[PDB]
Ligand binder design. Structure first.
Ligand SMILES: Nc1ncnc2c1ncn2[C@@H]1O[C@H](COP(=O)(O)OP(=O)(O)OP(=O)(O)O)[C@@H](O)[C@H]1O
Ligand SMILES: Nc1ncnc2c1ncn2[C@@H]1O[C@H](COP(=O)(O)OP(=O)(O)OP(=O)(O)O)[C@@H](O)[C@H]1O
Ligand SMILES: Nc1ncnc2c1ncn2[C@@H]1O[C@H](COP(=O)(O)OP(=O)(O)OP(=O)(O)O)[C@@H](O)[C@H]1O
Ligand SMILES: [K+]
Ligand SMILES: [K+]
Ligand SMILES: [K+]
Ligand SMILES: [Mg+2]
Ligand SMILES: [Mg+2]
Ligand SMILES: [Mg+2]
Lengths: 523, 523, 523
């Protein structure tokens, strides 16, 4: 359609206004004194959330240029959520700070591409300094504290995550789901988890989580690829009067002969899903055999000759819950048979004792780790649904932060790590003066998380930023108690991955946006 | 419908206003100090782009006559992008300059057709002078510099293109695709590339690139043309539950019995495509055999008697990525078997040693060059999707510019080549005075790229244009450093094809538009 | 009333938009290639004028903040017109340039008060350098050239002013008035001129010149101050049926018993005016006696005892034209008696021969200079009234410029003097960096007159500014012939007072306006 085309300062101030609307809505949530945001839903009751990416996602502005700025910055929170599952508000605050100071530099006549290059150089150096400053999770041993900080100082949530990682291992799979009582429960049940996703984007359920849950599902397993429709239409009908939702695990799944016909079939009462299987050839066969033994099901094959038309519903596997996500699909509780599960575990232990090839040994030890660790499940306890969603979001943040902590390490929380790396980057210089100003813009913007935290405390951000900068090491500002101390000692720990990801995604988007001279949108 | 009809100066100033809106939006992006343009998308987040043709494509105006002018000039950027893949902003700047000065001449009462003839004569002479001024890429040997200049002074991108051309040859196929890390990666993998396009315009995917990508596709090969639908409906169903997207390579593909039925089948989850095969008869058979051996597939034939109904999914070829474009379709990574690939390479080397016919020898050496060079793939590394699109556009510009440089040569960058050829054309005369004024309009307009570059530097375009004109040879103005020097020495190189194409397409459209006395549009 | 209150950038861009509207309307008139502006009048036919202050005065904008900016800049042209009578367009161009560059510096975050201080320091230094660069009019001897340049290269006007100054002296009084023929006539007639103004602001005639003209007036002279109304009401009635307009010359004139009653008397057919007399005591008596002898009138006094009630209309003085202005009031042609005038001249020559006191000698020699020089009158010849107003404005500009040239000297025209003094001020520094930037803003803005002249020539301002800067001395750019040369040799001379006044008034207003953070206006 016809386009509104804005240039220079007018376009930049409109885009910055959109950035500011999104970032203010997100930044009210930052820190232990951060507040909640109510997002209206046409689907049902409004959602009360502290999660920054949720607020960012809901933001859309009437002014098209302001909306453009808001959408580009919303990408920061989305990328931070996708990569680390936490720090989306920190990422938004950093992005807004970089954009604000970089646009001020642009208004000062400095070359915006050189400002972006300086920002990028400063952020690369700051990521290196964050890696250097990071303390490995083995050394720190504060999973409870990391989860507590990520759960908005909910010590119960952090303790639950710590117990789950003590039971299923620091690499074991933990899944958050809605409970029934008022208290958060933890249960380690036998389940499975593989790094695959759904093959159809229309499988999304009513909740907007992007991960689809099925209660008491039926499991179908196949390694050979079926061709004709009429040889599993009876099997499809059998599962279509079994009563339990169908989850198929295969090598790969198409949509033009399976997904389209079935979506033309139902209207959305009960869901049927199909996903890939990890590995290929013998590894995929072993994976499907393990899943079938876990769920009590069977795997069809060409060599066996066991056809689908002879399969019954008792032959197929049965589970209690499955959560399918693009990144990773988990089967929460497959009943099967406990004796059969133990026998398979013993058989694969004999496989440990027999195998000698390095790749075979490592994949088989991955199999035994997945079997022995099991699946930890956290039942979120809340009196109401709005409290359920808020608490589940906080527990999911805690899980993501603890995973990031065991993956990449921890740094001082409360924006202190960014302050320290900014102080360590004070001598960083670019190729010209505009690159130096971009570096300074990035360094000042890495003070923004701490300053926003202090603002959310009702305190003076410049005084606290000055006091933290004047300190050294993990000295920082407890925002829960409004006093200074060693951030590690008071347990205010951030995952290094979370801080680094927030900085990187904020920098990429914000450095791109400060380089914009014209914006084109609809009238 | 009813038509608004405008004449003479009113029509011309409206059309020029539309030209100016489009050209200003595009020209803010010109040069190393050029800035980015944010294009709003209804599909998702706005795209930040320096690419001039992207900005030009997004431009559409409310005023119908201004929109008419904008659309005709948008044709300049589109043609420059189609022909050279670079210089679209230079082409737009040249077109706007020719239009502005030619409309000034028209207002001076000079015959617009004679002005157009003078512009055309000057541009033909300037293309000849650009060919004379061009330095062959073998002599210059600055592929890294050409790619760096085209990538907006991104030395990493230019070095990556230079390494890719050092690995797969200056004629080898290089494909840009989205990476996963933050860094640009280069990998030379075994693949295929042929000069064919899709037979259906509705195969366009969600991205507006015009080239469609498929991840881990299945490969179907056929030289004989099948007739009845029921003899590959089972095979179609097999691929429709194989899980991988289908890509058919045949002699030629229709749409009234294949495309319409399948588009009535799916709603757009997984795509199935079919394309032509290069050559005919024995050459097409050799091409399909080579592709099948690369992907591990098989080729059906009448002499063999191997029917499609007996084909299995293991018999069909499997790849990792394919990119289908109207100009050229590439298979990025076909796994097949490495030993089989090497054996086929040895067999075709024996074919080199055996064949003696000149056409057969040259086509067989083309086959061995395509097999030995392989496919270079550049993984664009970016933290975010908007940065991914911007960086991928810059790398695609660099690839197009390096291809144009090895095809047609290089000239001094920064608009210097056009300045030099304009100086060499100072004595060019037409058949009358209006043709001479058209020649002068073209010659002055070829200063416009340098002048716009200087304007984007915040500097004085007339002073720098005067200084560059007063110099000789590759003397010009480094806009990155705002100082004069030998453009070849500082590595500011433009592909001669890019400069020539920009000038020619700008001239054709602009010379046509300055001849317009009436415009007819909707009310 | 309720106030719209704007802050920061919004207020500044609105004010700059108003500045730009006024300055563009004025600047189209600058230089020999400058064009005319038509100002609509509700009174009658529109006025075509090249005069910059006329255009500036007519400018008023709908947007209140833009109007505010326009009004403050209009003060520049008004002050330049009041002080020098020329250079109002140069003053406006300088003011717009200072405002534009200073607002750019303000947007760059620099302290606007320090920018204003730097501008003021640069302008003080530039005024000193203009005084140093100035060539006295005695040395240059180019009154014809100064008048020609001020009359928009009208050599006839400059020659007329040169002849008038050759006849009545370089200090003699010259008055421009409408002629009757098509040619500009010059006549030196016996008249008087004193530095006084009207005592009532409601005496303004229908033309908006601010100086009121009376044709064939009657002259009344008085040194003693009358008290009762009834003792000159008969005399007032006598002049009220004499037929000629009344002009009273007294010590001082009130309004509450003279002006209010008479303005309640007439409706505006024939005007009666009263003005002060120069000097005091004996000097005022000598002045009134000289004026009475020039006009054939008589002066009342207490010592003489000659009362007003006995005065007749033949006793009162009679003239042909008088022009009354606040700065200076002139009697153009008082008939009186030529023999009486010569006898009075001889008597005052005897007074020269008799007087010895220095103050008495100098005032008496001022008297004899005023009597001997007489009054030069330039009859503007034009076919039409619009041409009459345009030509009269140009001749008035020429008169003001020649007066300024004989007062303060001449410098190279065409903005060259400002370029030279800016070059001589390249090492000027302030107390801080913002003051240095203000100095640079002023120095760059003194290039603006030449650059605007070049723009009005259709040429490239940066190239010509560079060429003029690269020269030295009076080297500059003839804009009439579009070529370089010695500005003094080609007769392009500006009065030093005009250039200095333009710079000073532009600097004062513009430096004040760049310091503005908030604007308050009506809604
Ligand atoms: N008691 C505390 N004192 C100081 N800083 C704290 C404290 N508790 C948390 N923080 C800091 O608050 C930040 C995390 O805040 P929050 O979890 O509200 O937002 P986020 O992680 O940026 O984003 P989101 O959770 O929405 O993805 C971290 O920098 C953390 O160190
Ligand atoms: N450092 C530099 N100094 C001078 N000129 C430069 C420099 N870097 C690039 N240029 C010039 O800028 C022009 C290319 O600019 P840019 O890539 O932004 O636009 P384009 O090639 O016209 O169009 P597009 O890339 O949008 O298709 C060329 O003329 C090139 O020589
Ligand atoms: N032939 C010429 N070549 C170069 N400069 C010239 C020439 N004639 C006049 N100028 C310059 O033009 C300027 C005067 O222009 P103009 O009289 O139109 O405007 P102004 O004096 O600024 O204002 P205004 O007359 O409206 O009060 C001076 O700087 C003068 O030197
Ligand atoms: K939060
Ligand atoms: K560009
Ligand atoms: K003027
Ligand atoms: Mg958090
Ligand atoms: Mg380019
Ligand atoms: Mg003048």
């Amino acid at each position: 359609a016809a386009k509104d085309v804005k240039f220079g300062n007018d376009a930049r101030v409109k885009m910055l206004r959109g950035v500011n609307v999104l970032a203010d809505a997100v930044k009210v949530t930052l820190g232990p004194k951060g507040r909640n945001v109510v997002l209206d839903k046409s689907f049902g009751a409004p959602t009360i959330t502290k999660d920054g990416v949720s607020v960012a996602r809901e933001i859309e502005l009437e002014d098209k240029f302001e909306n453009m700025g808001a959408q580009m910055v919303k990408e920061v929170a989305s990328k931070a959520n996708d990569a680390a599952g936490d720090g989306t508000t920190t990422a938004t605050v950093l992005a807004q700070a970089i954009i604000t100071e970089g646009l001020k530099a642009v208004a000062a006549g400095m070359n915006p591409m050189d400002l972006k290059r300086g920002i990028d150089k400063a952020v690369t150096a700051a990521v290196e300094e964050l890696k250097a400053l990071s303390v490995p999770c083995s050394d720190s041993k504060a999973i409870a504290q990391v989860g507590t900080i990520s759960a908005n100082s909910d010590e119960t949530v952090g303790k639950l995550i710590a117990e789950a990682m003590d039971k299923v291992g620091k690499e074991g799979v933990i899944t958050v789901e809605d409970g029934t009582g008022l208290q958060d429960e933890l249960d380690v049940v036998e389940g499975m988890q593989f790094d695959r996703g759904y093959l159809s984007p229309y499988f999304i359920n009513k909740p907007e989580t992007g991960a689809v849950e099925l209660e008491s599902p039926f499991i179908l397993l196949a390694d050979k690829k079926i061709s004709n429709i009429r040889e599993m239409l009876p099997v499809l009908e059998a599962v279509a009067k079994a009563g339990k939702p169908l989850l198929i695990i295969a090598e790969d799944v198409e949509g033009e002969a399976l997904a389209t016909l079935v979506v033309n079939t139902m209207r959305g009462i009960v869901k049927v899903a199909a996903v890939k299987a990890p590995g290929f050839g013998d590894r995929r066969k072993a994976m499907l055999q393990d899943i079938a033994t876990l769920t009590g099901g069977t795997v069809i094959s060409e060599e066996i000759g066991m056809e689908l038309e002879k399969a019954t519903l008792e032959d197929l596997g049965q589970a209690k819950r499955v959560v399918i996500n693009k990144d990773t699909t988990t089967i929460i509780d497959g009943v099967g048979e406990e004796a059969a599960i133990q026998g398979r575990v013993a058989q694969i232990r004999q496989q440990i004792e027999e195998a000698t090839s390095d790749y075979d040994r490592e994949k088989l030890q991955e199999r035994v780790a997945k079997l022995a660790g099991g699946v930890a499940v956290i039942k979120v306890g809340a009196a109401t649904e709005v409290e359920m969603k808020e608490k589940k979001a906080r527990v999911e943040d805690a899980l993501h932060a603890t995973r990031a902590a065991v993956e990449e390490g921890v740094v001082a929380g409360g924006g202190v790590a960014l302050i320290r790396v900014a102080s360590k980057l004070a001598d960083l210089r670019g190729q010209n003066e505009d690159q130096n100003v971009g570096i300074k813009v990035a360094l000042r913007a890495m003070e923004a998380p701490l300053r926003q935290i202090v603002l959310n405390c009702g305190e003076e951000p410049s005084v606290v930023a000055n006091t933290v900068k004047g300190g050294d090491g993990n000295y920082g500002y407890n925002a829960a108690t409004e006093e200074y101390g060693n951030m590690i000692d008071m347990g205010i720990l951030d995952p290094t991955k979370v801080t680094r990801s927030a900085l990187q995604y904020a920098a990429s988007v914000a450095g791109l946006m400060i380089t914009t001279e014209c914006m084109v949108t609809d009238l």
